Write an enzyme that holds these catalytic residues in place. Structure first.
Site, PDB file in Angstrom:
ATOM      1  N   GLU A 136       0.816  -1.243   0.000  1.00  0.00           N
ATOM      2  CA  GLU A 136       0.000   0.000   0.000  1.00  0.00           C
ATOM      3  C   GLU A 136       0.814   1.240   0.000  1.00  0.00           C
ATOM      4  O   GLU A 136       0.310   2.332  -0.272  1.00  0.00           O
ATOM      5  CB  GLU A 136      -0.889   0.200   1.248  1.00  0.00           C
ATOM      6  CG  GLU A 136      -1.360  -1.086   1.917  1.00  0.00           C
ATOM      7  CD  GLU A 136      -2.548  -0.801   2.790  1.00  0.00           C
ATOM      8  OE1 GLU A 136      -2.383   0.314   3.471  1.00  0.00           O
ATOM      9  OE2 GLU A 136      -3.561  -1.513   2.832  1.00  0.00           O
ATOM     10  N   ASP A 145      -7.586  10.662   4.527  1.00  0.00           N
ATOM     11  CA  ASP A 145      -7.912   9.694   3.510  1.00  0.00           C
ATOM     12  C   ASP A 145      -9.151   9.852   2.677  1.00  0.00           C
ATOM     13  O   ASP A 145      -9.669  10.939   2.441  1.00  0.00           O
ATOM     14  CB  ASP A 145      -7.762   8.222   3.944  1.00  0.00           C
ATOM     15  CG  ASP A 145      -8.903   7.731   4.801  1.00  0.00           C
ATOM     16  OD1 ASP A 145      -9.616   8.477   5.443  1.00  0.00           O
ATOM     17  OD2 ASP A 145      -9.055   6.423   4.782  1.00  0.00           O
TER      18      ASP A 145
END
Length: 162
Positions: free
Chosen positions: A11, A20
């Site tokens: 990731e 996010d």
């Protein structure tokens, strides 16, 4: 290779606070800042957490600091999980890593839904299941991830990443 490195690859790393996909703030590899509905809020969480001026950016070892704790916490959640503890216990130290990687992406609830490959997994069937894993929305969403994942589960090897 290690779960950290497996994840850096997977990731990746963020060293400065990024809000996010769903508002959360996050730092390092998925380390949530659960107490911040701000950012100023986020830096305090953070400075406080590590215990330095940081200013919204942590080193490299710092990011591993946090991750490690994330991993442990995750390990804990799996162990109290009935669908999961048995499997996990049955896994090697390489496959467990893979299983965690799955957690870090979709989370327990997620992983757990895979009621089948897990059975195969628990039962050592290293290819049937790995073959079972390619037919998942997961396989389709993140392919180079899923690939790399069911290959740490096909072979007990960091062959993939390394």
């Amino acid at each position: 290779m290690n779960i950290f490195e497996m994840l850096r690859i997977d990731e990746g790393l963020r060293l400065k606070i990024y809000k996010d996909t769903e508002g959360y703030y996050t730092i390092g590899i998925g380390h949530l800042l659960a107490a911040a509905a701000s950012l100023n809020a986020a830096k305090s969480e953070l400075d406080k957490a590590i215990g330095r001026n940081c200013n919204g950016v942590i080193t490299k070892d710092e990011a591993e600091k946090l991750f490690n704790q994330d991993v442990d916490a995750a390990v804990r959640g799996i162990l109290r999980n009935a669908k999961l503890k048995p499997v996990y216990d049955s896994l090697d130290a390489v496959r467990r890593c893979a299983l965690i990687n799955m957690v870090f992406q979709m989370g327990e609830t997620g992983v757990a839904g895979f009621t089948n490959s897990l059975r195969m997994l628990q039962q050592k069937r290293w290819d049937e299941a790995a073959v079972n894993l390619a037919k998942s929305r997961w396989y389709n969403q993140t392919p180079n991830r899923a690939k790399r994942v069911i290959t740490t589960f096909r072979t007990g090897t960091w062959d993939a990443y390394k």
